[PDB]
Subunit: 312 residues, 4 copies
Amino acid sequence: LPNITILATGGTIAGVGVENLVNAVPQLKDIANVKGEQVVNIGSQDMNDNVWLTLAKKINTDCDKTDGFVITHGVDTMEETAYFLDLTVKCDKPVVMVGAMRPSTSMSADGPFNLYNAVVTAADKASANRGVLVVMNDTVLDGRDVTTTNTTDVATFKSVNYGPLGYIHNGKIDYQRTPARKHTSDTPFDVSKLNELPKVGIVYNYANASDLPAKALVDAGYDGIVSAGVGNGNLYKSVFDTLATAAKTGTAVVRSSRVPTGATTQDAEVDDAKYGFVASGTLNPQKARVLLQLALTQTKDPQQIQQIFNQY
Amino acid sequence: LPNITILATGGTIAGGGDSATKSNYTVGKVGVENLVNAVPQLKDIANVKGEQVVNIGSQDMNDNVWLTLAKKINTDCDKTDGFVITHGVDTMEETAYFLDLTVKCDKPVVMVGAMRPSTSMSADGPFNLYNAVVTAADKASANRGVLVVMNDTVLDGRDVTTTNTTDVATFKSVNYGPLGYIHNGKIDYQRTPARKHTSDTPFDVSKLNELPKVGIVYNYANASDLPAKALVDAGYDGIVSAGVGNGNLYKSVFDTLATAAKTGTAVVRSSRVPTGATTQDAEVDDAKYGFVASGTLNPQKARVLLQLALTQTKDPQQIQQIFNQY
Amino acid sequence: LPNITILATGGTIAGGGDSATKSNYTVGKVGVENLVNAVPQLKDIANVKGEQVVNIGSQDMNDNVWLTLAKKINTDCDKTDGFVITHGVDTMEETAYFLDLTVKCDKPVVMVGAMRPSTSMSADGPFNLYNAVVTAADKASANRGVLVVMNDTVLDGRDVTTTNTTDVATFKSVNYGPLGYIHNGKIDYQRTPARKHTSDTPFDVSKLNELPKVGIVYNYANASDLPAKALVDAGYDGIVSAGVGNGNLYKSVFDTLATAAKTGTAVVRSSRVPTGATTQDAEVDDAKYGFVASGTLNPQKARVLLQLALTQTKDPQQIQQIFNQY
Amino acid sequence: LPNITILATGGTIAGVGVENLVNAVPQLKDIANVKGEQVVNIGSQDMNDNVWLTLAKKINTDCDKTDGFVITHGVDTMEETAYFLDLTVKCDKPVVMVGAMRPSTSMSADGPFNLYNAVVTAADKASANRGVLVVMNDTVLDGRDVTTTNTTDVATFKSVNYGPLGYIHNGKIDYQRTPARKHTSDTPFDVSKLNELPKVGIVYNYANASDLPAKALVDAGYDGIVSAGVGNGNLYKSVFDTLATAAKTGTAVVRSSRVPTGATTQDAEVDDAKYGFVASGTLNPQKARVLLQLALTQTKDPQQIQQIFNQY
Ligand SMILES: NC(=O)C[C@H](N)C(=O)O
Ligand SMILES: NC(=O)C[C@H](N)C(=O)O
Ligand SMILES: NC(=O)C[C@H](N)C(=O)O
Ligand SMILES: NC(=O)C[C@H](N)C(=O)O
């Protein structure tokens, strides 16, 4: 039976230490030797760069000691941690993230079977070499495209652009897809010696939007700003003016969208070359922030940033 | 054949590029007359009249165009049988809801856009506008609030949003579904919004020169509190949170918003999550902090309503009650 | 606390397997009392009473269970404040619509199922049933027709269907959306079905011992006409076509159905396509052949209505008019 | 510029010969040398085995004469032809199917740009080795999973289980996925010498369903029957009884579902080994019919049929 390490970070799946959780699902012993370590115990709305860094290091450092990783984490920023670990983890062994929408004590709590199926996925050899995974609602989702789609539904997690990698039925996975975008040990991002990441903020666009949020980030010397644009990554005029000024001033600018699916493209309404802006593609704003932070460890150059956004 | 007024505002529907097959295009360049004349069949369903109100990309929509549209619709109500408003897609969901809460005209107001410019191959704008006219002319379209018609579908202004960056099918009422489907110039209406709209709302914009100041702040891991603070220092009347999950906030964003709320800033919790209500009675004690839960309203839509709530009242429990009725 | 009657019929909600973590299970084995007692919190919201009506997999649902449910609900109307019906998922969409057209009780009838057996880990049945009771007890649930409650969502019997073979989230009203969302035992209703239901329909099953014979035939490339013919030779009163695309038929299926229609068999065009109306005025001249277009009704749902239409009339244009009002 | 062959079969995209169509889109000359041949001119509701066979042969025979194939076809059975060609085509060069929901003369007709983008996809070298494709509404969809989802919407075609392969913007495709299931020249199906296919019918399940359709197919000596089950491929009792009898009597039986997504699984309510039935997986009934017809050219054995359903 495979050796599987659970790294606990909190969330509503624990709404409680790694011990209790493991012990709540005695059927885990049917599929793996499960060992639990507590990294943190927080609601994922308070997820931060330091936790990210703790996790990337710990997985990379403990890779040879285990056959796989499950990370119990909150729902709220799961999609952001999944893609961070997707781009920084060097281990070629499965890393599977899982949470829950209802707590342990609620009617029809989703946590137990979620965990069961996260382990089935971490323990399956066919799960290797597909990047960092999220396993929720009987489904295996790549860490790049996965996002939460509904505020309360157990079925919230979806790969809303390119679809899931496979479905889990009766402790078995039929994989039919793997992400093409370069991930894990095919990426230049090496975070083993870093104690902090470049400062990247997100600003929202909408009608009559103020430029003040964007200005406060420029004023604070932020390394990057991600625009959550309207439509195909468009920007309200005040916001566009402030970011056209930040881009040439040592603040990288990534155009993403608040629209929940589809790529922000080049060649639409925004002359990106002319402003020194980067189009995020299908990366949603919080996702773009992950990749922007990590592109800034390698380079401050807009054109080389765009290339990274085109490859990872 | 009924009398329909097109109030044009721009958008990609009025967009042009130099090639039918390149994606590059510019917005707010083509006038209403060209739109009207690119749909030769409109004569069969209505006596159409265009007026260019502005000509912009909806990325640059703003309170003053809103005030201009509402007062214009309300003033001209008795000169026409219905309105179509051609408009960009990017903030269509915002304008549609603003109008849904402010038009007192009891004739259909139907917005419409296109995802491909008017120059492009298989441009979606021509049949979309045909279909917004059908809808505007249909007696059964009355008393449903303000509408958006795109891709053969009639959608209510409250729930409607854009779901994809390029897809002609982008416009969907993602929580409660469409009102009716359009086929052969006819509509099968199976729904009407329950929430109060139009002449059932207390909001009266007829003498308003401006709208209260409301900003939107985003939540994510390691979120800066600087955007929230910039809005607070500027004396904003309201702030909407685009929370994570069920309307949750990063600690530092939370702290800045709680303080603001004690000084009398209206603070609404919404969500960056694209479907589902930001609910009361979850991880935030709203009554403790003086916050308001947005319900199914996404952040840009909560802003519309919060701005309008702030013209009536500054009391958090009254703003809550408004966000439960409208 | 209101009085709620559970009428149990089986389903996976009443399903059991030998392991919590294997997928193998058997249906119609566990009685209503076990269901009720697996939701210890039901005492807080209603005085629940169970009656086992049958105990089957809904794969084996049939006209006689339909007639039994409708007459039972209609007879007992004044003994209770509402009904929950626990039922399999597989044909829930069919039973729900049959009831939606036949119940004359003006108290909520709410069906409910589960996608995992009651034995399984994180079984969905317990909270689903909790939530069908909330809904059945809610005054605002009245006058909406017959309902299905699953995965925190209240759905109308007409549009509701199962969209995935295993997903707990399978139940969706795919054309017109849900009626309301359930959170913390409360509902925000934003819609009601427009189509006529319950005490507004002419269908009266109270003295009926059986239902007219209606079969469903599938279309695909190279389709055999033998299924259509087997139904015609057996003297079926109606045949529903699960057409390709917008309700289109393979030539040989078409030919068999046209003939049947001239001899007085009712023939309804529906579609195997999972959303969108089978429309009039497309590639089939319905008036020419004496066929009826199903609208948004999928084939199994057109069957429900066709069977009921056939108790009133055999005239194709009257069957059309029924499929446009109900 | 690549050489691209358009094979015309009809449909509403031509609602008209291959000549007119090509000529309707003069911008085709920007991306390819386009040559058109007329195979048939029918509404795809009348698609049949003979057309399928004509197409598989013609593509396989003309492979070395061109750089790619676009097939203009009706919407109604596009998904069935795509998977047939997916499993029989031996050419390693792109085969792209396209149709339209509105005719040439309608407001905002979708045909012209649909065709434009089908050619962009047939002409792109990155499109090779992904199987038979369907390109509709700016999207590239694998032929196995693609299905029509709405009766009238231009956006009807979707890969509703595993998602699309890529999106087309400004004449370029960002591919992020490829089907894992074996296709084209990785399949044993060889149709070069066949003038007919095994007789396979489809029966529908629902409440109070008659066994007569199923019996009429057994009585006619059909090689296979596909059940469009309820839920996870369940069968009404009368239908179950008739098919339990056909399965041991020289009529292969495949359990599929009328439910528009998800796999029909083994290990649920139906003891498949015991009845000699095959679970279709994610193959919907009309799709299962394609694979069932072609599995019957190799074998009549239920257990070896199931294996093929597990691999292609
Ligand atoms: N269900 C959850 O996990 C929500 C919680 N706020 C978290 O993200 O930690
Ligand atoms: N499709 C569109 O109309 C997008 C455009 N930027 C607008 O909103 O004006
Ligand atoms: N999930 C379920 O309930 C499926 C079961 N076969 C039924 O419909 O009874
Ligand atoms: N739009 C279409 O292509 C429908 C037509 N009946 C066909 O499949 O040939």
